[PDB]
Design a protein around this ligand. Sequence first.
Ligand SMILES: [Zn+2]
Length: 500
Amino acid sequence: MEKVFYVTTPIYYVNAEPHLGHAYTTVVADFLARWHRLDGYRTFFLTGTDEHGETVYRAAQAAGEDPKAFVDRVSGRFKRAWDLLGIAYDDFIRTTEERHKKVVQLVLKKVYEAGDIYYGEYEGLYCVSCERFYTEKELVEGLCPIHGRPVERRKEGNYFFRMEKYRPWLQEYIQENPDLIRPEGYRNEVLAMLAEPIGDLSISRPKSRVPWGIPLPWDENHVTYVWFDALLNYVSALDYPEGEAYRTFWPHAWHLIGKDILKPHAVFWPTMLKAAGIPMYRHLNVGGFLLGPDGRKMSKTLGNVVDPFALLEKYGRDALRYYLLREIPYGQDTPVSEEALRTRYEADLADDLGNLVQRTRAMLFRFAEGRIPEPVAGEELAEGTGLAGRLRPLVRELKFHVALEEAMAYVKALNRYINEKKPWELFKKEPEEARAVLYRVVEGLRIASILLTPAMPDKMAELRRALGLKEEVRLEEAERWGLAEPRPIPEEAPVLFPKK
Ligand SMILES: [Zn+2]
Protein backbone atom coordinates (compact mmCIF):
# COMPACT_ATOMS: atom_id res chain seq x y z
CA MET A 1 0.00 0.00 0.00
CA GLU A 2 1.99 2.95 1.36
CA LYS A 3 5.77 3.13 1.81
CA VAL A 4 7.21 -0.14 0.49
CA PHE A 5 10.82 -1.03 -0.23
CA TYR A 6 12.26 -4.08 -1.95
CA VAL A 7 15.90 -4.77 -2.71
CA THR A 8 17.80 -7.81 -4.00
CA THR A 9 21.41 -8.83 -4.54
CA PRO A 10 22.37 -11.23 -7.27
CA ILE A 11 22.26 -14.90 -6.30
CA TYR A 12 25.85 -16.08 -6.05
CA TYR A 13 27.38 -19.18 -7.60
CA VAL A 14 27.14 -21.58 -4.67
CA ASN A 15 30.60 -23.09 -5.27
CA ALA A 16 32.23 -19.66 -5.53
CA GLU A 17 34.32 -18.52 -2.54
CA PRO A 18 32.74 -15.44 -0.94
CA HIS A 19 34.82 -12.40 -1.86
CA LEU A 20 35.00 -8.60 -1.65
CA GLY A 21 32.64 -8.23 -4.60
CA HIS A 22 29.97 -10.42 -3.03
CA ALA A 23 30.57 -8.68 0.32
CA TYR A 24 30.30 -5.15 -1.10
CA THR A 25 26.99 -5.65 -2.96
CA THR A 26 25.32 -7.40 -0.01
CA VAL A 27 26.53 -4.65 2.37
CA VAL A 28 25.13 -1.88 0.17
CA ALA A 29 21.85 -3.74 -0.34
CA ASP A 30 21.69 -4.17 3.44
CA PHE A 31 22.33 -0.47 4.11
CA LEU A 32 19.37 0.30 1.85
CA ALA A 33 17.02 -2.21 3.53
CA ARG A 34 18.16 -1.04 6.97
CA TRP A 35 17.70 2.62 6.02
CA HIS A 36 14.15 2.21 4.74
CA ARG A 37 13.11 -0.03 7.63
CA LEU A 38 14.26 2.80 9.93
CA ASP A 39 12.21 5.17 7.76
CA GLY A 40 8.92 3.33 8.33
CA TYR A 41 9.00 1.30 5.13
CA ARG A 42 7.53 -2.21 4.77
CA THR A 43 10.77 -3.81 3.58
CA PHE A 44 11.88 -7.01 1.85
CA PHE A 45 15.60 -7.70 1.35
CA LEU A 46 16.53 -10.81 -0.62
CA THR A 47 19.83 -12.57 -1.41
CA GLY A 48 20.69 -16.19 -2.21
CA THR A 49 22.76 -18.75 -4.14
CA ASP A 50 23.00 -20.13 -7.71
CA GLU A 51 23.06 -23.88 -7.05
CA HIS A 52 22.66 -25.72 -10.36
CA GLY A 53 24.90 -26.63 -13.27
CA GLU A 54 27.34 -29.32 -14.33
CA THR A 55 30.58 -27.80 -13.04
CA VAL A 56 29.00 -27.67 -9.61
CA TYR A 57 27.70 -31.15 -10.36
CA ARG A 58 31.15 -32.54 -11.17
CA ALA A 59 32.67 -30.95 -8.07
CA ALA A 60 30.21 -32.80 -5.82
CA GLN A 61 30.96 -36.09 -7.62
CA ALA A 62 34.73 -35.85 -7.11
CA ALA A 63 34.25 -36.15 -3.34
CA GLY A 64 31.69 -38.90 -3.90
CA GLU A 65 28.89 -36.63 -2.72
CA ASP A 66 25.25 -36.18 -3.63
CA PRO A 67 24.90 -32.82 -5.46
CA LYS A 68 22.08 -31.73 -3.10
CA ALA A 69 24.08 -32.46 0.06
CA PHE A 70 27.14 -30.73 -1.47
CA VAL A 71 25.16 -27.54 -2.07
CA ASP A 72 23.45 -27.61 1.30
CA ARG A 73 27.02 -27.43 2.58
CA VAL A 74 28.95 -25.03 0.37
CA SER A 75 25.99 -22.63 0.36
CA GLY A 76 26.58 -22.24 4.09
CA ARG A 77 29.75 -20.36 3.21
CA PHE A 78 27.73 -17.36 2.04
CA LYS A 79 25.36 -17.66 4.97
CA ARG A 80 28.25 -17.58 7.45
CA ALA A 81 29.79 -14.62 5.67
CA TRP A 82 26.50 -12.67 5.91
CA ASP A 83 26.24 -13.49 9.61
CA LEU A 84 29.83 -12.26 10.02
CA LEU A 85 29.03 -9.12 8.00
CA GLY A 86 25.91 -8.42 10.07
CA ILE A 87 23.62 -8.63 7.05
CA ALA A 88 19.93 -8.65 7.98
CA TYR A 89 18.16 -10.10 4.93
CA ASP A 90 14.57 -11.29 5.06
CA ASP A 91 15.13 -14.37 2.94
CA PHE A 92 17.88 -16.44 1.36
CA ILE A 93 16.53 -18.18 -1.75
CA ARG A 94 18.38 -21.31 -2.91
CA THR A 95 17.73 -22.48 -6.45
CA THR A 96 17.20 -26.08 -5.27
CA GLU A 97 14.17 -25.09 -3.21
CA GLU A 98 10.83 -26.50 -4.43
CA ARG A 99 9.10 -23.14 -4.32
CA HIS A 100 11.73 -22.08 -6.82
CA LYS A 101 11.45 -25.02 -9.17
CA LYS A 102 7.69 -24.54 -9.25
CA VAL A 103 7.97 -20.89 -10.40
CA VAL A 104 10.69 -21.63 -12.96
CA GLN A 105 8.63 -24.32 -14.73
CA LEU A 106 5.52 -22.21 -14.24
CA VAL A 107 7.00 -19.23 -16.08
CA LEU A 108 8.68 -21.46 -18.68
CA LYS A 109 5.30 -23.09 -19.40
CA LYS A 110 3.82 -19.61 -19.75
CA VAL A 111 6.39 -18.45 -22.29
CA TYR A 112 6.22 -21.80 -24.05
CA GLU A 113 2.42 -21.76 -24.46
CA ALA A 114 2.70 -18.19 -25.77
CA GLY A 115 4.95 -19.41 -28.57
CA ASP A 116 8.21 -17.75 -27.57
CA ILE A 117 10.16 -20.98 -27.15
CA TYR A 118 11.38 -23.13 -30.03
CA TYR A 119 13.79 -26.00 -30.65
CA GLY A 120 16.83 -25.60 -32.85
CA GLU A 121 20.53 -26.28 -33.09
CA TYR A 122 23.44 -24.61 -31.32
CA GLU A 123 26.66 -24.99 -33.29
CA GLY A 124 30.11 -23.67 -32.41
CA LEU A 125 33.47 -24.26 -30.73
CA TYR A 126 33.12 -26.98 -28.11
CA CYS A 127 35.14 -28.82 -25.45
CA VAL A 128 34.14 -32.45 -24.86
CA SER A 129 35.94 -32.65 -21.52
CA CYS A 130 34.08 -29.55 -20.38
CA GLU A 131 31.02 -30.55 -22.34
CA ARG A 132 30.48 -26.87 -22.98
CA PHE A 133 30.61 -24.35 -25.82
CA TYR A 134 32.89 -21.30 -25.76
CA THR A 135 33.58 -18.17 -27.79
CA GLU A 136 36.84 -16.79 -29.15
CA LYS A 137 37.22 -14.67 -26.01
CA GLU A 138 36.28 -17.43 -23.55
CA LEU A 139 38.61 -20.15 -24.79
CA VAL A 140 42.13 -18.94 -24.09
CA GLU A 141 42.63 -18.21 -27.81
CA GLY A 142 43.76 -21.55 -29.21
CA LEU A 143 42.45 -23.93 -26.56
CA CYS A 144 40.14 -24.59 -23.63
CA PRO A 145 40.29 -22.19 -20.65
CA ILE A 146 39.81 -25.03 -18.17
CA HIS A 147 41.46 -28.00 -19.88
CA GLY A 148 44.01 -26.22 -22.05
CA ARG A 149 43.33 -28.22 -25.21
CA PRO A 150 42.01 -27.35 -28.71
CA VAL A 151 38.25 -26.77 -29.01
CA GLU A 152 36.00 -28.55 -31.51
CA ARG A 153 33.22 -27.23 -33.74
CA ARG A 154 29.94 -28.92 -32.83
CA LYS A 155 26.15 -28.51 -32.87
CA GLU A 156 23.82 -29.31 -29.96
CA GLY A 157 20.05 -29.59 -29.63
CA ASN A 158 18.61 -26.81 -27.50
CA TYR A 159 15.41 -24.85 -26.90
CA PHE A 160 15.48 -21.10 -27.54
CA PHE A 161 13.51 -18.03 -26.43
CA ARG A 162 12.50 -15.38 -28.98
CA MET A 163 14.52 -12.67 -27.29
CA GLU A 164 15.19 -10.48 -30.33
CA LYS A 165 11.40 -10.28 -30.66
CA TYR A 166 11.34 -7.99 -27.62
CA ARG A 167 14.29 -5.71 -28.40
CA PRO A 168 12.36 -2.78 -29.93
CA TRP A 169 10.06 -2.76 -26.89
CA LEU A 170 12.97 -2.90 -24.45
CA GLN A 171 14.85 -0.18 -26.26
CA GLU A 172 11.93 2.23 -26.30
CA TYR A 173 11.14 1.39 -22.68
CA ILE A 174 14.56 2.37 -21.38
CA GLN A 175 14.51 5.53 -23.53
CA GLU A 176 11.13 6.46 -22.06
CA ASN A 177 12.25 5.50 -18.54
CA PRO A 178 15.68 7.23 -18.17
CA ASP A 179 16.18 6.31 -14.48
CA LEU A 180 15.68 2.55 -15.01
CA ILE A 181 19.41 1.77 -15.25
CA ARG A 182 20.84 3.83 -12.41
CA PRO A 183 24.33 5.15 -12.78
CA GLU A 184 23.78 6.90 -16.12
CA GLY A 185 27.00 5.59 -17.60
CA TYR A 186 25.57 2.09 -17.63
CA ARG A 187 22.30 3.24 -19.21
CA ASN A 188 24.01 4.44 -22.37
CA GLU A 189 26.04 1.22 -22.39
CA VAL A 190 22.84 -0.82 -22.45
CA LEU A 191 21.10 1.50 -24.92
CA ALA A 192 23.99 0.74 -27.27
CA MET A 193 23.53 -3.01 -26.99
CA LEU A 194 19.88 -2.47 -27.93
CA ALA A 195 20.76 -0.48 -31.02
CA GLU A 196 21.98 -3.76 -32.48
CA PRO A 197 20.25 -7.15 -32.65
CA ILE A 198 20.40 -9.10 -29.40
CA GLY A 199 19.47 -12.43 -30.94
CA ASP A 200 17.53 -15.31 -29.37
CA LEU A 201 18.32 -16.88 -26.01
CA SER A 202 19.36 -20.51 -25.58
CA ILE A 203 17.62 -21.61 -22.36
CA SER A 204 18.36 -25.30 -21.92
CA ARG A 205 20.75 -28.17 -22.51
CA PRO A 206 20.28 -31.94 -22.76
CA LYS A 207 20.10 -33.68 -19.39
CA SER A 208 22.62 -36.22 -20.73
CA ARG A 209 24.98 -33.24 -20.84
CA VAL A 210 23.75 -31.32 -17.78
CA PRO A 211 21.86 -33.56 -15.30
CA TRP A 212 21.87 -31.00 -12.47
CA GLY A 213 19.09 -28.43 -12.89
CA ILE A 214 15.35 -27.85 -13.28
CA PRO A 215 13.77 -29.84 -16.17
CA LEU A 216 11.74 -28.24 -18.94
CA PRO A 217 8.01 -28.68 -18.27
CA TRP A 218 7.33 -29.72 -21.90
CA ASP A 219 10.42 -31.87 -22.29
CA GLU A 220 11.83 -33.58 -19.22
CA ASN A 221 14.92 -34.68 -21.18
CA HIS A 222 16.03 -31.03 -21.18
CA VAL A 223 17.30 -29.01 -18.25
CA THR A 224 16.85 -25.25 -17.67
CA TYR A 225 20.28 -23.70 -18.28
CA VAL A 226 21.12 -20.52 -16.36
CA TRP A 227 18.84 -17.60 -17.40
CA PHE A 228 15.29 -18.88 -16.78
CA ASP A 229 16.56 -20.51 -13.60
CA ALA A 230 18.69 -18.06 -11.64
CA LEU A 231 16.98 -14.93 -12.95
CA LEU A 232 13.58 -16.10 -11.67
CA ASN A 233 14.70 -16.08 -8.04
CA TYR A 234 13.56 -12.45 -7.74
CA VAL A 235 9.93 -13.46 -8.26
CA SER A 236 10.17 -17.00 -6.88
CA ALA A 237 11.16 -15.88 -3.36
CA LEU A 238 7.94 -13.81 -3.45
CA ASP A 239 5.84 -16.86 -4.36
CA TYR A 240 5.27 -15.13 -7.71
CA PRO A 241 1.83 -16.10 -8.86
CA GLU A 242 -0.52 -16.17 -5.84
CA GLY A 243 1.75 -15.14 -2.99
CA GLU A 244 0.87 -11.82 -1.39
CA ALA A 245 4.59 -11.04 -1.04
CA TYR A 246 4.67 -10.81 -4.83
CA ARG A 247 1.72 -8.45 -5.05
CA THR A 248 3.31 -6.34 -2.32
CA PHE A 249 6.99 -5.94 -3.25
CA TRP A 250 7.46 -6.69 -6.96
CA PRO A 251 6.02 -3.30 -7.97
CA HIS A 252 9.01 -1.77 -6.12
CA ALA A 253 11.86 -4.05 -7.22
CA TRP A 254 15.37 -2.59 -6.86
CA HIS A 255 18.00 -5.00 -8.21
CA LEU A 256 21.58 -4.40 -7.08
CA ILE A 257 24.32 -5.88 -9.31
CA GLY A 258 27.91 -5.47 -10.40
CA LYS A 259 28.50 -4.34 -13.97
CA ASP A 260 29.93 -7.82 -14.60
CA ILE A 261 26.36 -9.14 -15.04
CA LEU A 262 24.92 -6.11 -16.81
CA LYS A 263 23.62 -7.77 -20.02
CA PRO A 264 21.66 -10.56 -18.25
CA HIS A 265 19.89 -7.96 -16.07
CA ALA A 266 19.54 -5.10 -18.50
CA VAL A 267 18.88 -7.07 -21.69
CA PHE A 268 17.85 -10.69 -21.02
CA TRP A 269 15.90 -10.30 -17.75
CA PRO A 270 13.56 -7.55 -19.08
CA THR A 271 12.55 -9.41 -22.27
CA MET A 272 11.81 -12.42 -20.03
CA LEU A 273 9.48 -10.38 -17.79
CA LYS A 274 7.67 -9.00 -20.82
CA ALA A 275 7.23 -12.50 -22.26
CA ALA A 276 6.06 -13.86 -18.90
CA GLY A 277 3.51 -11.09 -18.41
CA ILE A 278 5.29 -9.86 -15.30
CA PRO A 279 5.83 -6.13 -14.64
CA MET A 280 9.29 -4.66 -15.11
CA TYR A 281 11.47 -3.78 -12.11
CA ARG A 282 11.78 -0.18 -10.99
CA HIS A 283 15.55 0.31 -10.88
CA LEU A 284 18.67 -1.58 -11.89
CA ASN A 285 21.43 -0.19 -9.69
CA VAL A 286 24.86 -1.02 -11.10
CA GLY A 287 28.07 -1.08 -9.09
CA GLY A 288 31.65 -0.85 -10.37
CA PHE A 289 34.82 -2.71 -9.42
CA LEU A 290 36.66 -2.53 -6.10
CA LEU A 291 40.21 -2.30 -7.49
CA GLY A 292 43.30 -3.27 -5.59
CA PRO A 293 45.49 -0.62 -3.93
CA ASP A 294 47.34 -0.31 -7.25
CA GLY A 295 44.09 0.84 -8.82
CA ARG A 296 44.30 -2.21 -11.06
CA LYS A 297 41.78 -5.05 -11.10
CA MET A 298 42.13 -7.33 -8.09
CA SER A 299 44.07 -10.40 -9.21
CA LYS A 300 46.18 -12.91 -7.28
CA THR A 301 48.68 -12.93 -10.14
CA LEU A 302 48.71 -9.17 -9.71
CA GLY A 303 49.06 -9.59 -5.94
CA ASN A 304 46.51 -6.93 -5.00
CA VAL A 305 43.80 -9.00 -3.29
CA VAL A 306 41.98 -7.38 -0.36
CA ASP A 307 40.27 -9.97 1.84
CA PRO A 308 37.09 -8.55 3.53
CA PHE A 309 37.12 -11.17 6.24
CA ALA A 310 40.69 -10.41 7.29
CA LEU A 311 39.83 -6.68 7.36
CA LEU A 312 36.63 -7.63 9.19
CA GLU A 313 38.53 -9.84 11.65
CA LYS A 314 41.02 -7.06 12.32
CA TYR A 315 38.79 -3.99 12.59
CA GLY A 316 35.27 -5.19 13.23
CA ARG A 317 32.18 -5.65 11.10
CA ASP A 318 30.93 -2.07 11.52
CA ALA A 319 34.29 -0.53 10.58
CA LEU A 320 34.56 -2.50 7.35
CA ARG A 321 30.94 -1.63 6.43
CA TYR A 322 31.32 2.09 7.02
CA TYR A 323 34.54 2.30 5.01
CA LEU A 324 32.98 0.39 2.12
CA LEU A 325 29.91 2.60 2.02
CA ARG A 326 31.90 5.77 2.69
CA GLU A 327 34.95 5.23 0.50
CA ILE A 328 33.13 4.16 -2.63
CA PRO A 329 30.72 6.12 -4.90
CA TYR A 330 28.42 3.34 -6.12
CA GLY A 331 28.89 2.65 -9.80
CA GLN A 332 32.51 3.80 -9.84
CA ASP A 333 35.55 1.55 -9.99
CA THR A 334 37.40 2.41 -6.76
CA PRO A 335 40.66 1.04 -5.29
CA VAL A 336 40.39 -0.38 -1.80
CA SER A 337 43.11 -1.18 0.75
CA GLU A 338 43.68 -1.93 4.42
CA GLU A 339 45.63 1.29 4.95
CA ALA A 340 42.66 3.29 3.64
CA LEU A 341 40.34 1.38 5.94
CA ARG A 342 42.82 1.95 8.78
CA THR A 343 43.06 5.75 8.38
CA ARG A 344 39.27 6.04 8.04
CA TYR A 345 38.96 3.88 11.18
CA GLU A 346 41.38 5.90 13.35
CA ALA A 347 40.03 9.22 12.11
CA ASP A 348 36.30 8.91 11.41
CA LEU A 349 35.50 6.22 13.93
CA ALA A 350 38.17 6.04 16.62
CA ASP A 351 38.70 9.82 16.82
CA ASP A 352 35.59 11.66 15.60
CA LEU A 353 32.97 9.44 17.26
CA GLY A 354 34.57 7.16 19.80
CA ASN A 355 36.68 9.81 21.45
CA LEU A 356 34.02 12.52 21.65
CA VAL A 357 31.64 10.03 23.27
CA GLN A 358 34.22 9.06 25.91
CA ARG A 359 35.40 12.60 26.60
CA THR A 360 31.77 13.73 26.74
CA ARG A 361 30.98 10.96 29.20
CA ALA A 362 33.93 12.09 31.32
CA MET A 363 32.71 15.68 31.23
CA LEU A 364 29.25 14.55 32.25
CA PHE A 365 30.47 13.03 35.47
CA ARG A 366 32.65 16.07 36.21
CA PHE A 367 30.34 18.96 35.32
CA ALA A 368 26.80 17.50 35.21
CA GLU A 369 26.95 14.85 37.93
CA GLY A 370 27.00 11.79 35.69
CA ARG A 371 23.60 12.24 34.13
CA ILE A 372 22.18 13.83 31.00
CA PRO A 373 21.54 17.53 31.70
CA GLU A 374 18.01 18.93 31.55
CA PRO A 375 17.07 19.57 27.87
CA VAL A 376 17.82 23.00 26.36
CA ALA A 377 17.89 24.50 22.86
CA GLY A 378 20.23 23.34 20.13
CA GLU A 379 20.86 26.77 18.64
CA GLU A 380 23.69 26.18 16.17
CA LEU A 381 23.47 22.43 16.64
CA ALA A 382 19.71 22.25 15.92
CA GLU A 383 20.29 22.13 12.17
CA GLY A 384 21.27 18.49 12.57
CA THR A 385 17.62 17.48 12.70
CA GLY A 386 17.18 18.43 9.05
CA LEU A 387 19.82 15.92 7.97
CA ALA A 388 17.39 13.01 7.74
CA GLY A 389 15.58 15.00 5.08
CA ARG A 390 18.84 15.66 3.20
CA LEU A 391 20.07 12.06 3.33
CA ARG A 392 16.85 10.41 2.07
CA PRO A 393 17.21 11.39 -1.62
CA LEU A 394 20.99 10.92 -1.48
CA VAL A 395 20.50 7.37 -0.28
CA ARG A 396 17.63 6.57 -2.65
CA GLU A 397 19.73 8.07 -5.48
CA LEU A 398 22.71 5.83 -4.52
CA LYS A 399 24.87 8.52 -2.88
CA PHE A 400 25.87 6.60 0.27
CA HIS A 401 29.33 8.13 0.59
CA VAL A 402 27.89 11.64 0.37
CA ALA A 403 25.15 10.76 2.86
CA LEU A 404 27.68 9.40 5.34
CA GLU A 405 29.91 12.38 4.59
CA GLU A 406 27.16 14.79 5.70
CA ALA A 407 26.22 12.88 8.86
CA MET A 408 29.84 12.61 9.91
CA ALA A 409 30.35 16.30 9.19
CA TYR A 410 27.70 17.05 11.80
CA VAL A 411 29.71 14.90 14.20
CA LYS A 412 32.88 16.83 13.32
CA ALA A 413 30.79 19.93 13.89
CA LEU A 414 29.86 18.55 17.33
CA ASN A 415 33.53 18.17 18.30
CA ARG A 416 34.20 21.66 16.92
CA TYR A 417 31.41 22.92 19.16
CA ILE A 418 32.60 21.56 22.50
CA ASN A 419 36.23 22.45 21.73
CA GLU A 420 35.00 25.94 20.84
CA LYS A 421 32.70 26.53 23.83
CA LYS A 422 35.11 24.89 26.28
CA PRO A 423 32.66 23.42 28.84
CA TRP A 424 35.51 23.14 31.37
CA GLU A 425 36.26 26.85 30.90
CA LEU A 426 32.51 27.51 31.29
CA PHE A 427 31.96 25.71 34.59
CA LYS A 428 33.80 28.48 36.42
CA LYS A 429 31.72 31.31 34.98
CA GLU A 430 28.35 29.80 34.14
CA PRO A 431 27.95 26.05 34.81
CA GLU A 432 24.50 26.29 33.25
CA GLU A 433 25.91 27.35 29.90
CA ALA A 434 28.39 24.58 30.61
CA ARG A 435 25.63 21.96 30.87
CA ALA A 436 23.62 23.43 27.99
CA VAL A 437 26.68 22.93 25.78
CA LEU A 438 27.01 19.35 27.02
CA TYR A 439 23.31 18.58 26.43
CA ARG A 440 23.62 19.91 22.89
CA VAL A 441 26.51 17.46 22.37
CA VAL A 442 24.53 14.51 23.70
CA GLU A 443 21.39 15.29 21.67
CA GLY A 444 23.53 15.85 18.58
CA LEU A 445 25.28 12.53 19.17
CA ARG A 446 21.85 10.85 19.48
CA ILE A 447 20.73 12.29 16.13
CA ALA A 448 23.94 11.43 14.28
CA SER A 449 23.92 7.93 15.76
CA ILE A 450 20.50 7.28 14.23
CA LEU A 451 21.77 8.36 10.82
CA LEU A 452 24.76 6.02 11.03
CA THR A 453 22.80 3.02 12.33
CA PRO A 454 22.11 1.42 8.89
CA ALA A 455 25.90 1.36 8.26
CA MET A 456 26.89 0.37 11.82
CA PRO A 457 23.90 -1.23 13.63
CA ASP A 458 25.63 -2.71 16.69
CA LYS A 459 28.09 0.07 17.44
CA MET A 460 25.54 2.85 17.18
CA ALA A 461 23.23 0.88 19.48
CA GLU A 462 26.20 0.56 21.83
CA LEU A 463 26.97 4.28 21.55
CA ARG A 464 23.37 4.96 22.55
CA ARG A 465 23.97 2.70 25.56
CA ALA A 466 27.17 4.46 26.64
CA LEU A 467 25.19 7.71 26.92
CA GLY A 468 22.10 6.17 28.51
CA LEU A 469 19.82 6.87 25.51
CA LYS A 470 16.89 4.92 24.02
CA GLU A 471 18.60 2.06 22.19
CA GLU A 472 16.11 1.10 19.45
CA VAL A 473 15.33 3.96 17.12
CA ARG A 474 13.46 5.37 14.11
CA LEU A 475 14.57 7.94 11.52
CA GLU A 476 11.78 10.34 12.53
CA GLU A 477 13.25 10.55 16.04
CA ALA A 478 16.22 12.24 14.36
CA GLU A 479 14.00 14.98 12.97
CA ARG A 480 12.93 16.40 16.37
CA TRP A 481 15.20 18.24 18.81
CA GLY A 482 15.27 17.65 22.58
CA LEU A 483 14.50 13.92 22.90
CA ALA A 484 17.53 12.86 24.96
CA GLU A 485 16.26 12.37 28.51
CA PRO A 486 18.14 13.77 31.57
CA ARG A 487 18.68 10.41 33.25
CA PRO A 488 21.94 8.90 34.55
CA ILE A 489 24.47 7.56 32.02
CA PRO A 490 26.10 4.16 32.74
CA GLU A 491 28.90 4.34 35.32
CA GLU A 492 30.91 2.16 32.93
CA ALA A 493 31.24 1.84 29.15
CA PRO A 494 33.96 0.27 26.96
CA VAL A 495 35.71 2.20 24.21
CA LEU A 496 33.50 2.32 21.11
CA PHE A 497 36.30 1.91 18.58
CA PRO A 498 39.34 0.35 20.35
CA LYS A 499 42.90 0.99 19.18
CA LYS A 500 43.91 -1.30 16.35
ZN1 LIG B 1 37.50 -28.29 -21.59
